[PDB]
């Protein structure tokens, strides 16, 4: 049912760059690309959740052809323009290191993906992914806890739920539970689609609540930057209260590191009522209600 693998490593999907747009404004930190790709002349098929591999030119510093990076899919089944004819991503350019000749590291895929012109052919593999599935009940009640590109699958559920043209498209989704996104980036020009984030709470604000946690410009009560973790505990309470309700569903998305503050947040919340929280938690993992990608 759930489309997996229809293109693999050693016969990719061709797919033709429409369009790569920048995603971080002026002011802030780093280059986050979102990139369609045209999905016509092929049969990949994906759904919101999933992610997809990009194999980039070239050899390593050993001589052997790079292997494909796995990306969140950015966009919903239908594409960015819902005509089921594109797929988007999100990407990041990584960079790092210190003073040690050559002393600039750029990331192999990041930087062509985030590069990359339109027009270019690019080598596609799956959908993969079964772990970060929205579910199907419209009266589910869907909490997103996101860093960075961690955005991308959350983007795929909002949309769906709530841009006009996808409640057009999809008559037996149309979405009436409560969604939470705490959004966490380093500045308000980092904040990723950050105008249609904002569009949707205005239009939908008893199903949708937009929460930011800014580290450049916030502070936690102790005095440290704002991170989500420090929302996650903010909000800890009114959470867990949302996290019993059988139909309640969350997912983590971003960057390693964000889910131990949140457990920890989380864990004092439920002791309060006698419940160990990575107990319960391990219970909705295997029911298949909390949803983890972190990378
Ligand atoms: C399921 C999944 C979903 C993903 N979704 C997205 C997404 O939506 N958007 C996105 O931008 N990325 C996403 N990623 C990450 C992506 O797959 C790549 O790993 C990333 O883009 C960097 O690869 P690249 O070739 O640019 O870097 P590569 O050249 O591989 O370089 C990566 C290497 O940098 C080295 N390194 C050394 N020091 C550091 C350091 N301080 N910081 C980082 N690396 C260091 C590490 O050894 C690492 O293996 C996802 C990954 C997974 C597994």
Same mark, same amino acid.
């Given at each position: 049912?759930?489309?997996?693998?229809?293109?693999?490593?050693?016969?990719?999907?061709?797919?033709?760059?429409?369009?790569?747009?920048?995603?971080?404004?002026?002011?802030?930190?780093?280059?986050?690309?979102?990139?369609?790709?045209?999905?016509?002349?092929?049969?990949?098929?994906?759904?919101?959740?999933? !992610? /997809?591999?990009?194999?980039?030119? *070239?050899? =390593?510093?050993?001589? &052997?052809?790079?292997? #494909?990076?796995?990306? !969140? /899919?950015?966009?919903?089944?239908? *594409?960015? =323009?819902?005509?089921? &004819?594109?797929?988007? #991503?999100?990407?990041?350019?990584?960079?790092?290191?210190?003073?040690?000749?050559?002393?600039?590291?750029?990331?192999?895929?990041?930087?062509?993906?985030?590069?990359?012109?339109?027009?270019?052919?690019?080598?596609?593999?799956?959908?993969?992914?079964?772990?970060?599935?929205?579910?199907?009940?419209?009266?589910?009640?869907?909490?997103?806890?996101?860093?960075?590109?961690?955005?991308?699958?959350?983007?795929?559920?909002?949309?769906?739920?709530?841009?006009?043209?996808?409640?057009?498209?999809?008559?037996?989704?149309?979405?009436?539970?409560?969604?939470?996104?705490?959004?966490?980036?380093?500045?308000?020009?980092?904040?990723?689609?950050?105008?249609?984030?904002?569009?949707?709470?205005?239009?939908?604000?008893?199903?949708?609540?937009?929460?930011?946690?800014?580290?450049?410009?916030?502070?936690?009560?102790?005095?440290?930057?704002?991170?989500?973790?420090?929302?996650?505990?903010?909000?800890?309470?009114?959470?867990?209260?949302?996290?019993?309700?059988?139909?309640?569903?969350?997912?983590?998305?971003?960057?390693?590191?964000?889910?131990?503050?949140?457990?920890?947040?989380?864990?004092?919340?439920?002791?309060?009522?006698?419940?160990?929280?990575?107990?319960?938690?391990?219970?909705?993992?295997?029911?298949?209600?909390?949803?983890?990608?972190?990378?």
């Amino acid at each position: 049912d759930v489309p997996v693998n229809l293109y693999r490593p050693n016969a990719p999907f061709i797919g033709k760059v429409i369009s790569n747009e920048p995603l971080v404004k002026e002011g802030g930190i780093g280059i986050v690309q979102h990139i369609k790709f045209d999905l016509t002349g092929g049969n990949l098929k994906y759904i919101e959740g999933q !992610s /997809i591999g990009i194999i980039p030119p *070239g050899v =390593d510093k050993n001589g &052997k052809p790079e292997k #494909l990076r796995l990306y !969140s /899919i950015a966009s919903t089944r239908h *594409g960015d =323009d819902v005509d089921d &004819k594109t797929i988007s #991503l999100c990407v990041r350019q990584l960079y790092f290191k210190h003073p040690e000749f050559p002393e600039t590291v750029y990331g192999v895929c990041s930087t062509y993906l985030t590069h990359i012109e339109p027009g270019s052919e690019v080598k596609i593999t799956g959908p993969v992914g079964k772990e970060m599935l929205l579910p199907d009940d419209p009266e589910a009640n869907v909490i997103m806890l996101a860093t960075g590109t961690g955005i991308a699958p959350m983007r795929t559920y909002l949309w769906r739920m709530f841009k006009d043209a996808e409640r057009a498209a999809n008559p037996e989704y149309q979405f009436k539970g409560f969604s939470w996104l705490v959004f966490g980036v380093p500045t308000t020009p980092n904040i990723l689609y950050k105008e249609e984030l904002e569009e949707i709470q205005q239009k939908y604000p008893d199903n949708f609540r937009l929460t930011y946690a800014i580290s450049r410009e916030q502070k936690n009560p102790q005095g440290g930057r704002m991170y989500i973790q420090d929302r996650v505990a903010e909000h800890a309470d009114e959470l867990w209260q949302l996290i019993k309700n059988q139909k309640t569903h969350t997912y983590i998305c971003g960057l390693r590191g964000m889910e131990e503050g949140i457990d920890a947040a989380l864990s004092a919340a439920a002791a309060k009522e006698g419940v160990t929280w990575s107990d319960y938690q391990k219970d909705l993992k295997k029911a298949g209600r909390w949803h983890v990608e972190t990378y």
